[PDB]
Amino acid sequence: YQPYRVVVLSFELLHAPATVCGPKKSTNLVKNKCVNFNFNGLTGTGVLTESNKKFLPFQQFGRDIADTTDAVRDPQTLEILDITPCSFGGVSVITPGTNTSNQVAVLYQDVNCTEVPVAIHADQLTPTWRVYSTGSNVFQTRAGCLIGAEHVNNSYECDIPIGAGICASYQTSQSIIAYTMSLG
Amino acid sequence: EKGIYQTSNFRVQPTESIVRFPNITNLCPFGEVFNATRFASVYAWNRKRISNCVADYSVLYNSASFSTFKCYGVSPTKLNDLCFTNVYADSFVIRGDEVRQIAPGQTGKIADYNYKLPDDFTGCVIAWNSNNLDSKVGGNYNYLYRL
Amino acid sequence: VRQIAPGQTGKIADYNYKLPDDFTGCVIAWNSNNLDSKGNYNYLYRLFRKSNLKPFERDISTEIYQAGSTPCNGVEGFNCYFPLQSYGFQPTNGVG
Amino acid sequence: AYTNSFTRGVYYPDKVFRSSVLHSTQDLFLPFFSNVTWFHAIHDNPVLPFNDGVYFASTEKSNIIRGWIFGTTLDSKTQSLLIVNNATNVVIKVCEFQFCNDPFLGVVYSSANNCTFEYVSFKNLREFVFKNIDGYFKIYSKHTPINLVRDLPQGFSALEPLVDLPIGINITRFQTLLALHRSYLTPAYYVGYLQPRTFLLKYNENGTITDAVDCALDPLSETKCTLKSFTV
Amino acid sequence: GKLQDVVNQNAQALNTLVKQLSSNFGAISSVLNDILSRLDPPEAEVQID
Ligand SMILES: *[C@@H]1O[C@H](CO)[C@@H](O[C@@H]2O[C@H](CO)[C@@H](O)[C@H](O)[C@H]2NC(C)=O)[C@H](O)[C@H]1NC(C)=O
Ligand SMILES: *[C@@H]1O[C@H](CO)[C@@H](O[C@@H]2O[C@H](CO)[C@@H](O)[C@H](O)[C@H]2NC(C)=O)[C@H](O)[C@H]1NC(C)=O
Ligand SMILES: *[C@@H]1O[C@H](CO)[C@@H](O)[C@H](O)[C@H]1NC(C)=O
Ligand SMILES: *[C@@H]1O[C@H](CO)[C@@H](O)[C@H](O)[C@H]1NC(C)=O
Ligand SMILES: *[C@@H]1O[C@H](CO)[C@@H](O)[C@H](O)[C@H]1NC(C)=O
Ligand SMILES: *[C@@H]1O[C@H](CO)[C@@H](O)[C@H](O)[C@H]1NC(C)=O
Ligand SMILES: *[C@@H]1O[C@H](CO)[C@@H](O)[C@H](O)[C@H]1NC(C)=O
């Protein structure tokens, strides 16, 4: 037999611009590493980096010739960041044939080679796969980075081509080498 | 056989998940409908039309103040990510036992005669008690229900 | 009975009984007003859960529901609730 | 009472930065070399239609024209829009207004009934584009200093966005608002119209639209539009 | 001109291939996430296909 203090709400979604809803949170931006981002609705995945472009003050993001997003404006500090993809490539296996031996060398294309143990999941791989991420046999070429072969200073004919003047063969006990090819 | 074979691909995986959004400025005026001076009776419940603001529902849900909170079609953790064109707000004065009929499908003294939630609902109810300051000594004949 | 289809949302399909998105079978439903109305209160269903159910998985617990920040231990106080709510079935209701 | 445009009414269609790129878009534009009605108020405020968008430009010198009425029926039954400059603030109001058949504001007149919301924020050629798509009202503008004889110039300059509004009215007609001295209550501006065209814009090294090509003006410009270049 | 045409033809073909990612082919959008954060899974698998 005591008074109450009631408040009752109800919503509508008749087809119109929605002018009322709740707050959308934020985190703090991190640069120079591969993240998933959400800049005001625009989603993606890449590496954020301080830029040189100057937008016009009403423009929110930039595009290139094939219409991909490659620059964005942060909506709190109004600066311009770059977008660059997280690195990818192919994995190629160099073998001398299984009628002869069983040791191989692995080429990782376009890596810079210090990123190899972390681009592959070398902590999560087999211990027989972890040999080909780190070692003494690490060689950086224009075609990528070659791990598992010995960079000699001779020159022979090409046996298994790699690219940009580099070949690889199985002679020398026996091992897998990597050399600049000779023309004659 | 002897050669070089392309067996797989690699890709560096993302580590974090950032979100960037503009500053939160234009709040909704809930102080006008939760800290008002005086209220109105049952049959003459006042309506408020709330539009064009950001509404913080977590401070209403976590208030340490009410006695009633129930709703249908929404949960109190979904309310911060779902949008509407218009939100209405009603508030009035009722008694102790006159509260449980405020739901879809009930009858009472004032449910089917003054104030009915229709066949389905979306919004939520919030109620507490008013004997702390809204009942003077010597009787209170200042708010008027329907018979 | 709308929510006993694959890929549904609500409270039956989210907290009580979840069908997988690849389902192979039949769903059979019929009106049973003449045996379940007296309103009966032995027909119970959950209201809150920490997350949604996996397909074909049960949950039987009356551990009470915390939603704010107070670690409520067996107390149905402010912002701490009991999951199981019951229907009310009588011929005073319309179909639905 | 008629003149043409020569290159006039090009705006930035979206908020995307592009540098040193020719880009082809399809949107509502005012066509090149087209007749605009000229309203010189010498002795002039009729009710013009709002078909799908309106161009507006004024060669003023002394702050006469202030704003616009929009809406459909003007009868304070359905909703209408209002824009007024009170020499310090740009007031935008969406209500059921009391409407004179010759309405103005003298050098003073407003209304309020049952309504939604409000928003508040001769070297003078001010250009405007009003557009009403999918529940949003859009306004683009630019001003530039001219001294030609009377009319619109021949140069090229693009119209930046000003404000977007979430209003949601069916808009059918509109008319202007001037400032005049005598309050005679009785109970130099141009108007174009937008068509669904296809243009070819040229962004320079800083993101500014520097030139455009109307891809249906003549057979030479359709060659520039398929080759995606400004030279053939 | 015979060597310039081989470079222009290969760049035209790679440009068309990347610009074909902005077409929706009958779906509601051309973005994978806006199909996913708008529809429920049993009929977001016909807009992805
Ligand atoms: C959004 O709000 C933040 C929080 O205040 C603003 O950040 C500050 O801006 C001032 C400029 O007036 C700087 O001096 C401060 O260093 C900023 N940081 C803090 C922690 O105060 C930010 O400018 C706002 N962004 C807008 C309005 O676009
Ligand atoms: C109604 O008004 C009271 C103040 O009389 C508000 O209570 C305070 O809210 C602030 C907001 O941060 C808290 O910091 C205080 O702890 C609250 N209590 C006191 C005693 O000051 C209350 O939030 C208002 N309710 C609304 C606006 O819905
Ligand atoms: C290589 O393959 C041939 C094919 O039959 C086989 O006879 C021979 O044993 C293999 N091994 C050698 C030559 O070491
Ligand atoms: C590869 O690593 C070297 C070592 O510092 C660095 O100088 C160079 O910029 C890197 N090249 C890249 C990232 O392309
Ligand atoms: C190959 O020659 C280069 C040339 O300076 C030398 O630096 C390198 O040590 C040589 N590699 C050897 C000896 O393995
Ligand atoms: C446009 O103006 C020209 C010259 O004033 C006139 O000849 C023509 O009839 C007008 N109307 C159209 C539709 O071209
Ligand atoms: C473009 O930007 C450059 C560099 O800031 C500036 O020098 C130039 O004035 C700008 N405008 C042009 C080229 O119209």
Please name the helix (run of DSSP H) or strand (run of DSSP E) that holds residue A163, with its range, or none.
strand A160-163
Among partner residues C48, C78, C96, which is closest to B64 by beta-carbon distance? C78
Question: Which residues of chain E approach chain C closer than 8 Å at the C-beta?
Answer: 40-43
Q: Is-contact B58 B80, C-beta < 8 A?
A: yes
In 3D space, the residue among D39, D1, D7 whose CA is nearest the CA of residue D153 turns out to be D7
Q: Is-contact C10 B75, C-beta < 8 A?
A: no
Torsion of CA B3, B4, B8, B14, to 10 degrees: 160
Rounded Cα–Cα distance for residues D146 and B101 (Å)? 71
CA distance to D86, D116, D188, per residue, from D64 (Å): 12, 29, 10
CB contact burial D93-123 (16+ within 10 A = b; e otherwise): bbbbbebeeebbbeeeeeeeeeebeeeeeee
Rounded Cα–Cα distance for residues B43 and A164 (Å)? 87
- The helix/strand/coil state of A72 is strand
* Resolution, Å (one decimal): 2.9
Exposed/middle/buried for E35, CB within 10 Å: 0-12, 13-18, 19+? middle
The label of the residue with tokens 């006469």 reads D64
Rounded Cα–Cα distance for residues D212 and D123 (Å)? 25
The label of the residue with tokens 């009868």 reads D75
Rounded Cα–Cα distance for residues A33 and A177 (Å)? 35
Rounded Cα–Cα distance for residues D107 and D87 (Å)? 11
Residue A162: other Cβ atoms inside 10 A: 24
Please name the helix (run of DSSP H) or strand (run of DSSP E) that holds residue E18, with its range, or none.
helix E2-19
The residues facing D49 across adjacent strands are D173
Token digits of residue B111: 């449910």
Token digits of residue D42: 């010498």
Q: Is-contact A145 A108, C-beta < 8 A?
A: yes
Q: What is the DSSP letter of D11?
A: B
Rounded Cα–Cα distance for residues E18 and B2 (Å)? 36
Q: What is the DSSP letter of A179?
A: E
What's the per-residue H, E or C state across D133-179?
ECCEEEEEEEEECCCCCCCCCCCCCCEEEEEEECCCCCCCEEEEECE
CA distance to A71, B15, B21, B110, E8, per residue, from E14 (Å): 22, 31, 35, 72, 10
Token digits of residue A42: 């625009």
Rounded Cα–Cα distance for residues A106 and A116 (Å)? 11
Rounded Cα–Cα distance for residues A62 and A140 (Å)? 34
The CATH superfamily of D2-232 is Spike glycoprotein, N-terminal domain (2.60.120.960)
The closest residue, in CA terms, to atom 12 on ligand 6 is: D35
Q: Is-contact D210 D156, C-beta < 8 A?
A: yes
Token digits of residue A73: 């404006």
Residue A81: other Cβ atoms inside 10 A: 22
In 3D space, the residue among C56, C68, C73 whose CA is nearest the CA of residue C19 turns out to be C56
Please name the helix (run of DSSP H) or strand (run of DSSP E) that holds residue D214, with its range, or none.
strand D209-214
Q: How far away, in angstroms, is A138 Cα from ligand 5 center?
A: 15
Please name the helix (run of DSSP H) or strand (run of DSSP E) that holds residue A117, with its range, or none.
helix A116-119
Instruction: Determine the length of chain D.
Output: 232
For residue C66, report the phi and psi dihedrals to the nearest 5 degrees.
-95, 140
Start-to-end CA distance of chain D, whole Å, equals 38
Please identify, by atom number, the ligand 2 atom nearest to the C-alpha of residue B34. 28
What's the per-residue H, E or C state across chain B?
CCEEEEEEEEECCCCEECCECCCCCCECCCCCCCCCCCCCCCCCCEEEEECCEECCCHHHHCCCCCCEEEECCCCCCCCCCCCECEEEEEEECCCCCCCCCCCCCCCCCCCCCCCCCCCCCCCEEEEEECCCCCCCCCCCCCCCCCC
Domain ranges of chain D: 2-232
CB contact burial A4-26 (16+ within 10 A = b; e otherwise): bbbbbbbbeeeeeebbbbbebeb
Please identify, by atom number, the ligand 1 atom nearest to the C-alpha of residue B23. 1
Ligand nearest to the CA of A142: 4
In 3D space, the residue among B62, B59, B127 whose CA is nearest the CA of residue B90 turns out to be B127
| Strand spans (E) along D10-167 | 16-17, 22-29, 36-39, 48-49, 54-58, 67-69, 82-85, 90-94, 105-106, 117-120, 125-133, 136-144, 160-165
In 3D space, the residue among D63, D28, D65, D68 whose CA is nearest the CA of residue D47 turns out to be D68
Token digits of residue D76: 């304070």
Rounded Cα–Cα distance for residues D187 and B111 (Å)? 51
Out of D206, D208, D210, mutate this one to test ligand 7's pocket (max ligand atoms within 8 Å of CB): namely D206
Rounded Cα–Cα distance for residues B102 and B111 (Å)? 7
Q: How far away, in angstroms, is A26 Cα from ligand 1 center?
A: 14
Q: Is-contact B47 A10, C-beta < 8 A?
A: no
What residues contact E46, with CB distance under 8 A and at least 6 apart?
none
Categorise residue D168: left if φ over 0, alpha if ψ from -120 to 50, beta otherwise: left
Rounded Cα–Cα distance for residues A61 and A74 (Å)? 9
- The residue among A15, A52, A56 with the most chain D CBs within 10 A of its CB, best to mutate, is A56
Token digits of residue C54: 């996996």
Please list every residue in chain A whose beta carbon sits closer than 8 Å to the beta carbon of residue E18: 66, 68
Please identify, by atom number, the ligand 6 atom nearest to the C-alpha of residue D3. 5
CB contact burial A96-112 (16+ within 10 A = b; e otherwise): beeeeeeeebbbbbebe
Rounded Cα–Cα distance for residues A83 and A79 (Å)? 13
Rounded Cα–Cα distance for residues B16 and A35 (Å)? 5
For residue E44, report the phi and psi dihedrals to the nearest 5 degrees.
-95, 0
Exposed/middle/buried for B125, CB within 10 Å: 0-12, 13-18, 19+? buried
In 3D space, the residue among E32, A85, A83 whose CA is nearest the CA of residue D17 turns out to be A83
- The helix/strand/coil state of A155 is coil
Q: Is-contact A64 B44, C-beta < 8 A?
A: no
Method: cryo-EM
The residues facing A62 across adjacent strands are A71, D17
Q: Chain A to chain D, count of Cβ pairs less than 8 Å apart? A: 42
Instruction: Compute the nearest-CA separation of B22 from chain C (Å).
Output: 27
Q: What is the DSSP letter of E35?
A: H
Instruction: Compute the nearest-CA separation of A76 from chain D (Å).
Output: 17
Exposed/middle/buried for A93, CB within 10 Å: 0-12, 13-18, 19+? middle
Rounded Cα–Cα distance for residues D200 and D215 (Å)? 7
Q: Is-contact A70 A62, C-beta < 8 A?
A: yes
